[PDB]
Design a protein around this nucleic acid. Structure first.
Ligand code: FES
Ligand SMILES: [Mg+2]
Ligand SMILES: [Mg+2]
Ligand SMILES: [Mg+2]
Ligand SMILES: [Mg+2]
Ligand SMILES: [Mg+2]
Ligand SMILES: [Mg+2]
Ligand SMILES: [Mg+2]
Ligand SMILES: [Mg+2]
Ligand SMILES: [Mg+2]
Ligand SMILES: [Mg+2]
Ligand SMILES: [Mg+2]
Ligand SMILES: [Mg+2]
Ligand SMILES: [Mg+2]
Ligand SMILES: [Mg+2]
Ligand SMILES: [Mg+2]
Ligand SMILES: [Mg+2]
Ligand SMILES: [Mg+2]
Ligand SMILES: [Mg+2]
Ligand SMILES: [Mg+2]
Ligand SMILES: [Mg+2]
Ligand SMILES: [Mg+2]
Ligand SMILES: [Mg+2]
Ligand SMILES: [Mg+2]
Ligand SMILES: [Mg+2]
Ligand SMILES: [Mg+2]
Lengths: 94, 122, 162, 94
RNA sequence: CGAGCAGUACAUGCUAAGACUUCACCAGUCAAAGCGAACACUCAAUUGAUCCAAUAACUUGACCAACGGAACAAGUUACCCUAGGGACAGCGCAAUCCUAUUCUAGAGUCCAUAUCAACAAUAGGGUUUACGACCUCGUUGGAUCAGGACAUCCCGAUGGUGCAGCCGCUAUUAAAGGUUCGUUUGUUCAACGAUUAAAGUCCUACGUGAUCUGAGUUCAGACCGGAGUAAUCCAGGUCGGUUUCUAUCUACUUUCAAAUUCCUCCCUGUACGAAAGGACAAGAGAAAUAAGGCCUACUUCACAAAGCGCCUUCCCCCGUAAAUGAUAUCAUCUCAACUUAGUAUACCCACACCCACCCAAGAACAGGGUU
RNA sequence: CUGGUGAUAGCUGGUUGUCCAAGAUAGAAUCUUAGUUCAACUUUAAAUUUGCCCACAGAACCCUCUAAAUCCCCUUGUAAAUUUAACUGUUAGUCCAAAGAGGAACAGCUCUUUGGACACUAGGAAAAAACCUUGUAGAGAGAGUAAAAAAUUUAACACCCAUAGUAGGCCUAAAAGCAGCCACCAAUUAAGAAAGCGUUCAAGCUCAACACAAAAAAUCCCAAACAUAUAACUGAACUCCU
RNA sequence: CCUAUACCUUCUGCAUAAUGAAUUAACUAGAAAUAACUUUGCAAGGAGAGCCAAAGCUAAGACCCCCGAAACCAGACGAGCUAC
């Protein structure tokens, strides 16, 4: 219930997805020492890191392939100018 | 006979009235996709099942990030009825090496680099 | 006719992709309709106006009578007897005849033209000869008339004849 | 009364099926999702020419890992310690 | 619709890269270069393995056409045997057939619509159907007991009629009740005879064979006709001819109890009609059947049972026909408000005498009496 | 009866601990279609390097024209594919969607082709092999969702009036506006040389004119119902959560 | 109260009203070669004559069921029933 409302508020449709209710540790020592991280949280943290690294990997790969294409166009255009420089017309043209 | 479907190129041409409804920008296209499978590959042709595996969409409701390039879009145009496509938004920018462990993909498509799980003081 | 059993996926497609006529916020019949565009007057209507004007101008005695549902043989027989005394029986539609009297000297004859009416006209006011012909049928009433541009009732015609 | 000849949903004379109100709404909900999918596939970030060869190095390196894993298959090492450790089955107290 | 060839060559010689391939294999197909000569034949198919036989070698040999070919073997069995498999009921919006509407051509003197109805169309039902534009052939009556449908054969009510009246015709409504007995004959059905208010159409695993029975499916014998050299065969003709079941389970074992119909008389020889002819409605009296009882007599018979004998038998029906009166100041019976016509009782009831006996009560049990 | 004999049976039936893993539908030949052999598919081991997806480019003229598409296929997304070794097993599959085939057969039957599902899970369509939702497996007295509930009630209606050059000529026993042909004028404020009816034929009439959209079968109908409180909520073995 | 259409076998698909089973105890059904693989020994050699070998050879481990016909043949036994 209320999944559509949560999506409009920037939250997940399932409250168990993320947020304070899920990500926060479930317990801590009475002395005050924080509890060791839960197994589910460690799995999510590793899973999110892999997603984050893929985002960086894909974003840098497109920029590298976009700069490379621009350099080929710059190199190709320069080749046209070089061939016309070494020619001196004569005869009728002079 | 039932065969593969060729989607006309006219379909994938955004109209001026579409940009004011979804908030996209033709002059500054989004760099990455957020593809999420929301439909079962069961009762679908085998070539649609193969593409789902190629896109890493085996598990449903599991967001995956793909590059907004024609070759990848070509596979998306085949299984566009089984997936949900959303642009990846980076209000804080790309994650850094010190932010890899603090990222979180929200349902709005934004990938924040500071996940504190704390109410806004504002 | 949906003879073949459509597939349910196809059947839902037909139901979702159904024509939806646009519905105005306010029904057009409830809005004040625009005034009807004017038309050109009928050539017969303007021909009657010229004919009617001649009747009121040429002859001075006009007798207004109600065209009762007499038999055609009896109604033609009375017309012939009036013709012996040079008394015509003019009939004009009221929808053209009333507006003519609305803008005219004879503006007070308007209530007399209610229902089936007929006009008895003659160059010379032979009132006495006309009354005796009308006395043959007690059910034929003389509503009124206008002699020498003067409005008179049936009683005046009796006094005028005497 | 009310017999359906043959089977219900198959054959020539089938049981009639009718579309409910929420059946239409569910299909419209699916259509709106796919309608927005057509919008995001209309704005590629790079063209066909720019994209070409932008991932050749990574794809070639990724396949060499498959070749390395496939061509490194071999029977495992056999240790003399494992053979001698079976003699502990008869280990007893004095 | 073809093919089981033919014709031109006589280097239609010899060798050899790379490929195709009738979805396997077998088989089949193309081919540069080279030697040797000259200066990969046409043709869609035009074909046959191995073994074996012949021959010095070369090479050749099968309508092996059941054409991946067994060196060489038919018919019949109802005298049949064995191992297995399949099988009234069920699917069928095209064609065809039937029924009811639609169409309004046409019959009916006139006259679409009192009736009837062509080409067709729309619904319901039944049936047929992918190839020899061949011939033939692959469950049903009866007895008992019935259940149900209505698309009603009879009885009832109501419109129309080319309805005077009696009879009829047609349509709406009605399944409460009823729907006979015989002679031949029988893909088991018709014909005929005598009646009846009528001798309904169907469905129910021929409704119903652990209730019964006849025929067929067809048989072990036998002939007649026809077929075959014969064995034997033929939906052909005829004669003869074996299934059984001790009820475990379900269901059921006194709906306690409202009757239908005919004839005669009466009205009446009346209404009607020129007469001939000839009614309704109302009443009465005798009948048959059905249901439920009974033994006074009769009869079969005797402390009794039984019928052939006697007694009793009680509601309505929904189609329509009309008033007042609006939408639509008339009118109009009204899926307008509205008015009228036809729009239940009876039975059963109180219950620790009880051993035992008796009983018109009863399989046991139970029940009634024992004053 | 004994022996050969434990005859043979492509046929029927049966085939005994636990747990996990991979795993379904092209064909050819056959005294063959109840079988077998090969291929395809599947399994295991091994070796090797590309495999799938796919941008252009490219693939016939005919009988005049015409489909969804297919082949090939760099990038790219991906992790498989080929080969070597060793064998076994499976095969008329069924139904649904679509295009067709069978003398030019709308359905149905039979048979091809493409795809899906079923012979593997669960939820929903009433019960439900083939429709829809959904697949990777455990525990929970958590959560968010997917598909997912049939609509429809249909027929009023004109008011008023009509005299006349005439039976317009023709042919017909005579057929007159109204059997038939020709012409289609015309008096009157305004009326068809007649649009329907009825006369052997006439006569009588109305109108034009003038004013004023079905359904019925067999044991017994079949959830109960409800036009009125601001679309959210319910809902899986899918996903999330310990 | 709620939920749940017995098992095996045979077919595309069995709650199937298709096959088998009253139940208990005992008995009752996968036997092997070449090649390949795996693990030792030795090695251009291996093997306790013979045999194989262009890394082979030797040894071991590891794969191939049960019941049921009508029949056919040989040798005996039967006419105390029945046919004559
Ligand atoms: S409701 Fe607006 S015109 Fe009647
Ligand atoms: Mg091949
Ligand atoms: Mg053969
Ligand atoms: Mg052959
Ligand atoms: Mg062949
Ligand atoms: Mg015989
Ligand atoms: Mg009766
Ligand atoms: Mg009836
Ligand atoms: Mg008899
Ligand atoms: Mg007899
Ligand atoms: Mg029986
Ligand atoms: Mg005898
Ligand atoms: Mg039972
Ligand atoms: Mg055996
Ligand atoms: Mg066989
Ligand atoms: Mg598995
Ligand atoms: Mg779980
Ligand atoms: Mg008129
Ligand atoms: Mg839930
Ligand atoms: Mg799961
Ligand atoms: Mg049973
Ligand atoms: Mg069965
Ligand atoms: Mg048994
Ligand atoms: Mg022999
Ligand atoms: Mg033999
Ligand atoms: Mg003897």
């Amino acid at each position: 219930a209320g999944g559509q409302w949560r999506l409009q508020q920037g939250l997940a449709a399932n409250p168990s997805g993320y947020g304070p209710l899920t990500e926060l540790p479930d317990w801590s020592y009475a002395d005050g020492r924080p509890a060791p991280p839960m197994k589910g949280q460690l799995r999510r943290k590793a899973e999110r890191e892999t997603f984050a690294r893929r985002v960086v990997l894909l974003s840098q790969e497109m920029d590298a392939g976009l700069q490379a294409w621009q350099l080929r166009q710059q190199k190709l255009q320069e080749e046209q100018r070089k061939q016309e420089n070494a020619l001196k017309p004569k005869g009728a043209s002079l | 006979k039932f065969t593969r479907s060729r989607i006309p190129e006219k379909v994938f041409q955004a109209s001026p009235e579409d940009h004011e409804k979804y908030g996209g920008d033709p002059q500054n296209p989004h760099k990455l996709h957020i593809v999420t499978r929301i439909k079962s590959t069961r009762r679908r042709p085998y070539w649609e099942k193969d593409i789902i595996k190629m896109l890493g969409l085996e598990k449903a409701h599991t967001p995956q990030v793909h590059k907004n390039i024609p070759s990848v879009n070509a596979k998306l145009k085949v299984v566009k009825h089984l997936i949900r496509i959303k642009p990846l938004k980076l209000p804080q920018g790309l994650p850094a090496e010190e932010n890899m462990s603090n990222t979180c993909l929200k349902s709005t498509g934004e990938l924040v680099v500071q996940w504190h799980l704390k109410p806004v003081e504002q | 006719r949906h003879r073949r059993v459509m597939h349910f996926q196809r059947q839902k497609l037909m139901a979702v992709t159904e024509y939806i006529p646009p519905k105005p916020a306010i029904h057009p019949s409830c809005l004040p309709s625009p005034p009807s565009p004017p038309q050109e007057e009928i050539g017969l209507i303007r021909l009657l106006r010229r004919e009617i004007a001649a009747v009121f101008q040429d002859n001075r005695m006009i007798a207004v009578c109600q065209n009762v549902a007499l038999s055609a043989e009896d109604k033609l027989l009375m017309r012939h007897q009036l013709r012996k005394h040079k008394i015509l029986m003019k009939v004009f539609p009221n929808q053209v005849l009333k507006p003519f009297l609305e803008d005219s000297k004879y503006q007070n004859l308007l209530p007399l033209f209610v229902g089936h009416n007929m006009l008895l006209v003659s160059e010379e006011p032979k009132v006495k000869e006309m009354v005796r012909i009308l006395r043959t049928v007690p059910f034929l009433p003389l509503l009124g008339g206008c002699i020498d541009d003067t409005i008179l009732s049936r009683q005046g015609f009796i006094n005028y004849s005497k | 009364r009310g017999r359906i000849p043959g089977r219900q949903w198959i054959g020539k004379h089938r049981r009639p099926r009718f579309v409910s109100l929420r059946a239409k709404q569910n299909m419209i909900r699916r259509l709106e999702i796919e309608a927005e999918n057509h919008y995001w596939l209309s704005m590629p970030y790079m063209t066909r020419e720019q994209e070409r060869g932008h991932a050749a190095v990574r794809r070639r390196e990724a396949f060499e890992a498959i070749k390395a894993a496939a061509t490194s298959k071999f029977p495992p090492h056999r240790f003399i310690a494992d053979q001698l450790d079976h003699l502990n089955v008869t280990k007893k107290w004095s």
